[PDB]
């Protein structure tokens, strides 16, 4: 119901955020950000809570050499919450996911940002810590 609000989005296309679920992937080469019309010369950028296409660069060879959807869960670029607290996360991080928002993994190492948790429920269910 209640919609997202924009947040300072510090993952341009070209990032390798570390996969923080138990798949067997280690990295997630963001090749594109979902739901970006975009402008000339401008890199598509995914903050936290953003869907994303993601090649795996290192990990299991099942996953390597193909594209998966993914979600950004933490991010090192400090966004501002509506309550006027800026927040950043120590590492950029995501999870491999399917089109309809379900995880293909099962358990999320590390904390998930609540911008991502509220917007992705199945991620939120497998997230131990939030914010």
């Amino acid at each position: 119901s209640g919609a997202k609000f924009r947040i300072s989005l510090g993952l341009p296309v070209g990032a390798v955020i570390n996969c923080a679920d138990n798949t067997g992937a280690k990295n997630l080469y963001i090749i594109s950000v979902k739901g970006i019309k975009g402008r000339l010369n401008r890199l598509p950028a995914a903050g936290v809570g953003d869907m994303v296409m993601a090649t795996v660069k290192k990990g299991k060879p099942e996953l390597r050499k193909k594209v998966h959807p993914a979600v950004v869960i933490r991010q090192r670029k400090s966004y501002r919450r509506k309550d006027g607290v800026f927040l950043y996360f120590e590492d950029n991080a995501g999870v491999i996911v399917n089109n309809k928002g379900e995880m293909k993994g099962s358990a999320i190492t590390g904390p998930v940002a609540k911008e991502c948790a509220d917007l992705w429920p199945r991620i939120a269910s497998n997230a131990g810590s939030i914010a």
Partner: peptide, 21 residues
Amino acid sequence: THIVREVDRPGSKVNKKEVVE
């Protein structure tokens, strides 16, 4: 400067949540 306030737009995620401004 800042302010802080309770917001009352029902529907929003920020309904009954103290924002700064």
